[PDB]
Amino acid sequence: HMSKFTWKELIQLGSPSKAYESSLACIAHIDMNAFFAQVEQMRCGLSKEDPVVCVQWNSIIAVSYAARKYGISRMDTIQEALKKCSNLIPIHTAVFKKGEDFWQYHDGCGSWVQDPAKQISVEDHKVSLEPYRRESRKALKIFKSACDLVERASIDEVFLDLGRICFNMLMFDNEYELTGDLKLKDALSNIREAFIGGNYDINSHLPLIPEKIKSLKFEGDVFNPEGRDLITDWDDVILALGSQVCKGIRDSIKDILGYTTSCGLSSTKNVCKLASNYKKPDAQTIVKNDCLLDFLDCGKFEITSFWTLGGVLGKELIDVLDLPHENSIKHIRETWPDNAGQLKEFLDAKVKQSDYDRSTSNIDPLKTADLAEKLFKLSRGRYGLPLSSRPVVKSMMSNKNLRGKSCNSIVDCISWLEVFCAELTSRIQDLEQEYNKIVIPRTVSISLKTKSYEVYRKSGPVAYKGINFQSHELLKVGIKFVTDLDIKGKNKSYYPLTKLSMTITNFDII
Ligand SMILES: [Mg+2]
Numbered sequence: 001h002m003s004k005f006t007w008k009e010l011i012q013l014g015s016p017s018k019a020y021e022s023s024l025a026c027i028a029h030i031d032m033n034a035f036f037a038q039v040e041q042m043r044c045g046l047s048k049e050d051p052v053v054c055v056q057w058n059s060i061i062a063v064s065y066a067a068r069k070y071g072i073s074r075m076d077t078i079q080e081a082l083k084k085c086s087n088l089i090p091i092h093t094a095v096f097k098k099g100e101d102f103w104q105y106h107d108g109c110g111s112w113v114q115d116p117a118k119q120i121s122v123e124d125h126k127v128s129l130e131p132y133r134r135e136s137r138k139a140l141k142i143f144k145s146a147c148d149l150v151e152r153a154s155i156d157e158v159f160l161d162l163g164r165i166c167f168n169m170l171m172f173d174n175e176y177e178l179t180g181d182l183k184l185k186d187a188l189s190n191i192r193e194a195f196i197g198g199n200y201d202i203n204s205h206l207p208l209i210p211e212k213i214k215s216l217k218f219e220g221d222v223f224n225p226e227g228r229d230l231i232t233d234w235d236d237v238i239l240a241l242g243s244q245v246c247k248g249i250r251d252s253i254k255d256i257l258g259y260t261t262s263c264g265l266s267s268t269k270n271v272c273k274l275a276s277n278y279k280k281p282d283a284q285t286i287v288k289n290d291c292l293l294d295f296l297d298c299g300k301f302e303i304t305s306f307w308t309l310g311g312v313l314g315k316e317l318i319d320v321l322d323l324p325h326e327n328s329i330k331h332i333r334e335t336w337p338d339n340a341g342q343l344k345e346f347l348d349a350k351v352k353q354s355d356y357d358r359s360t361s362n363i364d365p366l367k368t369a370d371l372a373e374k375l376f377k378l379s380r381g382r383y384g385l386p387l388s389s390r391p392v393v394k395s396m397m398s399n400k401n402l403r404g405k406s407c408n409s410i411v412d413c414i415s416w417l418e419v420f421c422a423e424l425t426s427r428i429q430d431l432e433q434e435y436n437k438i439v440i441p442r443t444v445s446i447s448l449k450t451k452s453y454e455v456y457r458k459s460g461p462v463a464y465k466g467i468n469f470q471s472h473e474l475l476k477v478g479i480k481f482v483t484d485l486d487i488k489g490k491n492k493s494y495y496p497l498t499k500l501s502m503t504i505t506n507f508d509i510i
């Protein structure tokens with residue numbers, strides 16, 4: 001007898017461009033839970049047990065899991081949370097002041113204190129997220145150094161493709177020890193000699209795993225409610241090694257930066273993202289291939305839980321496919337269990353019946369084959385998408401919603417453009433570090449809403465004389481445009497404005 005996998009699917013792990021396509025893939029999704037709260041926690045020399053909460057104005061934007069033990073969520077106001085926790089530590093985010101080109105933390109201030117001098121008025125202030133962008137960047141530098149392929153899914157989430165690391169570790173690591181008596185080089189000498197030997201057809205089946213390797217330990221919580229054998233094939237051997245490696249990367253994030261992370265480990269991104277949100281914080285959820293259906297049917301997940309099926313598209317599928325309200329995943333598998341063609345024939349008929357409503361439908365009748373395959377694999381937990389890089393920036397905006405008189409004249413507009421130009425510059429610096437190239441916006445757009453909520457807009461070029469000398473250039477143009485729009489206003493209902501925004505587009509990366 002022999003393994004269910006081939007050499008092709010194992011060698012593929014060494015290819016950064018196609019390792020994800022292999023059923024032996026080892027993907028990881030790492031999430032820094034309540035990231036903003038973790039950042040403020042560390043900044044104030046606090047511990048994970050101190051119940052910090054990141055406040056914006058009157059709302060909570062991040063809840064440390066110490067504060068969640070008191071039932072605090074993002075739906076509560078600070079006053080509601082104070083009544084839930086009397087030792088709460090609300091920390092307000094950094095903030096610009098109207099007319100200043102720098103942001104500043106006002107620790108000890110906020111709408112929850114009584115002293116009127118310790119207030120952070122919303123009327124003449126704008127939030128700054130630079131502290132979080134800067135800390136997130138530090139995490140990526142740690143990720144990108146331990147993994148040759150990293151996707152920044154968001155400011156607090158990343159995917160890793162541990163393919164190359166797992167493969168090289170499987171075939172060449174001579175230092176790893178299963179126990180005090182057994183090293184990897186000895187337990188896997190059979191497949192290593194077979195690989196160096198080269199006497200295999202790439203479509204030949206791998207040799208059976210040796211009994212020696214079942215001593216290999218998973219680092220983390222292996223999701224296994226049915227008590228299946230842990231190491232039953234090479235997919236589990238790869239996944240086990242990846243759990244060890246991934247624990248080290250997550251411990252680097254905590255030893256260098258102090259941030260905790262929940263993690264999901266499997267053979268596909270969709271499953272990895274579900275696993276990381278299954279147990280948190282400071283957790284690591286492993287989903288073997290032989291436990292994929294157990295995981296998708298554990299009760300937490302429905303068809304709408306997948307990355308792309310949460311919106312209108314998902315809800316239309318529930319009606320077209322006549323899915324139950326619970327266990328819709330299991331229903332998809334069993335209603336079309338043989339092949340995606342069955343589901344494609346079902347979709348083709350449905351869109352071809354009477355009362356199809358093809359004019360408003362979100363189901364493209366020409367790509368029913370691509371869709372049927374997507375659902376067929378997601379429901380079986382084998383829909384592997386590649387780790388894509390963050391698309392290059394096309395547009396940035398900084399705006400402020402103005403309630404009251406905080407923008408009654410031209411001078412008040414310029415004061416806000418000074419804030420907008422500083423945030424856009426900060427956000428361009430963070431990009432120049434990610435792209436490792438210079439970033440130059442070539443056109444600027446100002447738009448504003450009058451007291452009657454009518455819109456005035458004007459765009460144009462920004463003449464960077466030298467190179468990357470923004471935050472003065474584009475404030476010139478910003479002030480020129482807001483002046484023109486004043487003259488267009490003139491004897492019209494204009495001030496006090498209700499909204500003001502600056503948008504930069506047409507970037508040149510060099
Ligand atoms: Mg998240």
Ligand SMILES: [Mg+2]
Nearest residue numbers: 099100415418
């Ligand atoms: Mg000023």
